[PDB]
Structures are given as structure tokens and as C-alpha cells.
Ligand binder design. Structure first.
Ligand SMILES: OC[C@H]1O[C@@H](O[C@H]2[C@H](O)[C@@H](O)[C@@H](O)O[C@@H]2CO)[C@H](O)[C@@H](O)[C@@H]1O
Ligand SMILES: OC[C@H]1O[C@@H](O[C@H]2[C@H](O)[C@@H](O)[C@H](O)O[C@@H]2CO)[C@H](O)[C@@H](O)[C@@H]1O
Ligand SMILES: *[C@@H]1O[C@H](CO)[C@@H](O)[C@H](O)[C@H]1NC(C)=O
Length: 398
């Protein structure tokens, strides 16, 4: 969509690049909301309304073709990101799901480089990524997410998408969802927006999940028909790693009886361990809290390989079939090596209560507990804060 007259004022966020010799050194980055979360309206004289809702192609009245859509649909800059529940303070990023006035912005943002016109491209195979988090205000059913998608570095800036990454264009993920614009272009045929996604963190105060999701296509792929479905180009389920799912119940939760006590802030370390020929072999998650390293649990479940890291043996044995079919850990690593964009978000699930995250095999939450209608009775204003985003040499971030 065509950028409007309103100014885009990106929150600044300091992050770090780390080595063993030099420690963690500060870097300036910026934060951008998803393009379609910006106000979208029509060109002068065309009346009120937007240019389509999530799940749909854009409307034919204004978007009969890409060229027309590009001139008839206007995307405004956001001059005050706090209106969308997005604020920064030095090295901290705060995402508010619900604002005091009752708006539910459910923000999703990306990390821009210091120029504001290209995403910061992270290349994590053979390196580690770490952050600090406050998960206290995330009850059952909430998903705070910090993850990587293989988006185009300028958001596919082009003739009909002059806005590009500066306006947060180009989002994709392993679910291949239909959005009315893809790569900043009207999605006239209602294709899905697919790409590899590495879910470093999907969590709340009750459960913590890690999952690589492979696709058999590089970068953003516009899928049609069955390509967008379960047996298609992308791994919807992912290879999930959650202590509960592997029969470890005392590792992560609200209180002193858990190794990682989510009533207090903590540090989250993720290492992407490569084999001698440079390909990804294992993903290793551990934590730090109150100045003490908390090593990963090992799996503790009959029929599950004994391991403290995600790898192909584990993913195969736990039934992560599309993960394996669409590239396995090497394939995930190949995407990581090419480079990926960092996305951070907070969201809930009206259809399914986020049960896969924290209910049943995945956590302590009861049936119905994670419904949005209940979430607000438990925590009226869910939020997350991510602090001191930092990446670099193995061993150097913590
Ligand atoms: O379901 C809608 C929400 O999707 C979130 O992104 C997911 C993505 O779809 C998955 O493939 C995987 O990568 O995890 C992501 C993080 O949970 C998105 O961040 C939200 O904004 C959407 O509401
Ligand atoms: O798009 C929603 C959500 O899906 C997650 O996968 C779930 C899936 O929704 C559920 O139907 C299936 O039975 O279990 C998987 C988990 O194994 C996915 O992992 C998330 O990233 C995604 O946000
Ligand atoms: C689950 O863990 C408990 C505690 O270690 C153990 O006694 C039990 O046998 C495990 N169950 C399975 C199915 O592995």
C-alpha cells in the first residue's frame, strides 16, 4: 500500500553483539509494527474503509489488480507507537496486549537496522541469541513470542511497495496465512505467505516452548491451494520442545518450586550448534536467574530419546513429520545461515485457547482456562517485556 502523509516514528532499541574477547557491545536498532497493523485506508474521494481483513484478498472495488491497489490503498505512518502497546526504554521493549482503555492491539513488531530501511538480518547458525524477559503478566492462553522468519531484508521494497521495511512490509511465517497484502503488494489471488520460521520463544508464565519450523522453499513463497495446507510447503506444527511434553514438571512455572521461577525476571539463552561442516545439528536452550545458570532439563519420557537438545533424532521420534520432510535441522540451519528477521509479538487464541502451549501434554492450564474471556478475568492487561537482546559467540552472551 502507498505510504500516507503521517510520519512513522520508530521506537529505538539498544541491543548487543557479543564475543568472548570483547563481551557484549551496544548497537542501535529500531522497532517497526507490521505493515497491516498501520492504519490502512483508501485514496482521496474513495470513501471510508480499509483494503481488506486478515485471511482474505483485498477488495476488488479498489484492488482489481496490483497496480490499482498500490494507488488506491494508503498506509499511514504511526507517530506514537504507545497507541499500539509498543514502547521502548533503552534496552527494554514492552509489548502490551490490552491497553487501559480496552483496545487490544496485540502488537507484532520487527527489528530494523540502524538505517530504518532494512531489517536487521540475524545469521545464527553456529552462534547464540539471548534475552532477558518478564513473563509475570502472561497467564494461561497468552503467547509472548520472539522468533525469526525468512522475510526479505527490505520488506521487498519495489515500485508498487515504496514503503518496504520502514513500514514493516513483507511478513511471512510457516503457517502460510492469507493476508490482503504480501510483500507490500495487493494479494489479488488470495495466496498464502509462507516462509521458514525459527520459534526461539513462545511462552507465558506457565509454559515455555521452542520450535523450528521448516519449509521446502527459500524466503517468502506465495502458496496456492494444497501448497498452503498441512501436506504443503511449510511445517505448521514445528518440532516442539517443552519440558511438560517430555515429562518434566518442575522446571518452569510460577513459584520457588520451579527451577525457572516465572514470578521473577530471567534470562533465556538459545545456542544453534553446528557440526564440523557448518550445518546446524542441535538447538540448546538454558536459562539464567538470580545470577545462576539453570541448565536445560533432559527428556524424561518413555519412547522419547534421552536428550537435552533439539535434534533430528528427537524430532523424528516425537512425530514431527513435516519438520523432517521439509528440511530437518540442516534445512532450518540453512535458512538461519542465509539470514532471518527478528519478530516479537503478544497474542491470544479465540479458537483454540492456545492449548498446544500450556494445556494437557504442554502444561498445567485447565480446559477453558486459556480462553480470552477468562484471560481478562485473571490478568486484565497482559504484557511482556524483552530486555538486553544480544547475540554472538557461543558462551559470550551470559
Ligand atoms: O496465529 C496468529 C499469530 O501468529 C503469530 O506468529 C506465529 C506464527 O504464525 C507461527 O508459524 C510460529 O512461527 O509462531 C509465531 C509466533 O507465535 C504472530 O506473531 C501473531 O501476531 C499472530 O496473531
Ligand atoms: O497457528 C497456531 C499455532 O499452531 C501451533 O501448532 C499446534 C497446532 O495449532 C495444533 O493443532 C497441533 O495439534 O499442535 C501443534 C503443536 O504441535 C504452532 O506450533 C504455533 O507456532 C502456531 O502459532
Ligand atoms: C514421568 O516422570 C516420572 C518422574 O520422573 C517417572 O516416574 C515416570 O515413569 C515418567 N513417565 C513416563 C511415561 O516416562
Amino acid at each position: 500500500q502507498k505510504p500516507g502523509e503521517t510520519k512513522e516514528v520508530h521506537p529505538q532499541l539498544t541491543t548487543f553483539r557479543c564475543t568472548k574477547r570483547g563481551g557484549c557491545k551496544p548497537a542501535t536498532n529500531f522497532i517497526v509494527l507490521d505493515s497491516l497493523s498501520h492504519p490502512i485506508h483508501r485514496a482521496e474521494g474513495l470513501g471510508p474503509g480499509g483494503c481488506g481483513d486478515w485471511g482474505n484478498p483485498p477488495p476488488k472495488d479498489v484492488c482489481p489488480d496490483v497496480e490499482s491497489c498500490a494507488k488506491n490503498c494508503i498506509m499511514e505512518g504511526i507517530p506514537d507507537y504507545s497507541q499500539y502497546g509498543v514502547t521502548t526504554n533503552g534496552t527494554s521493549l514492552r509489548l502490551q496486549h490490552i491497553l487501559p482503555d480496552g483496545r487490544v492491539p496485540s502488537p507484532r513488531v520487527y527489528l530494523l537496522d540502524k538505517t530504518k530501511r532494512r531489517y536487521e538480518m540475524l545469521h545464527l547458525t553456529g552462534f547464540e541469541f539471548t534475552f532477558d524477559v518478564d513473563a509475570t503478566k502472561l497467564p494461561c492462553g497468552m503467547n509472548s513470542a520472539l522468533y525469526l522468519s525468512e522475510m526479505h531484508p527490505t520488506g521487498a521494497k519495489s515500485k508498487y511497495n515504496p514503503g518496504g521495511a520502514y513500514y514493516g512490509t513483507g511478513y511471512c511465517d510457516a503457517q502460510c496465512f492469507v493476508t490482503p497484502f504480501i510483500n507490500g503488494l495487493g494479494n489479488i489471488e488470495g495466496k498464502g505467505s509462507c516462509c521458514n520460521s525459527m520459534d526461539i520463544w513462545e511462552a507465558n508464565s506457565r509454559a515455555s516452548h521452542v520450535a523450528p519450523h521448516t519449509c521446502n522453499k527459500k524466503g517468502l513463497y506465495l502458496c496456492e491451494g494444497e501448497e498452503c495446507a498441512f501436506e504443503g510447503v511449510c511445517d505448521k506444527n514445528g518440532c516442539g520442545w517443552n519440558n511438560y511434553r517430555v515429562n518434566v514438571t518442575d522446571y518452569y512455572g510460577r513459584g520457588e518450586e520451579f527451577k525457572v521461577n516465572t514470578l521473577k525476571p530471567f534470562t533465556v539463552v538459545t545456542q544453534f550448534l553446528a557440526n564440523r561442516r557448518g550445518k546446524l545439528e542441535k538447538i540448546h536452550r538454558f536459562y539464567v536467574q538470580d545470577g545462576k545458570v539453570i541448565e536445560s532439563f533432559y527428556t524424561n519420557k518413555e519412547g522419547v530419546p534421552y536428550t537435552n537438545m533439539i535434534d533430528d533424532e528427537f524430532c523424528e521420534a516425537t512425530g514431527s513429520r513435516k519438520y523432517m520432510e521439509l528440511g530437518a535441522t540442516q534445512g532450518m540451519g540453512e535458512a538461519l545461515t542465509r539470514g532471518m528477521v527478528l519478530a516479537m509479538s503478544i497474542w491470544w487464541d479465540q479458537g483454540g485457547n492456545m492449548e498446544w502451549l500450556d494445556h494437557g501434554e504442554a502444561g498445567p492450564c485447565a480446559k477453558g482456562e486459556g480462553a480470552p474471556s477468562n484471560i481478562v478475568q485473571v490478568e486484565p492487561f497482559p504484557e511482556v517485556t524483552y530486555t538486553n537482546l544480544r547475540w554472538g559467540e557461543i558462551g559470550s552472551t551470559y
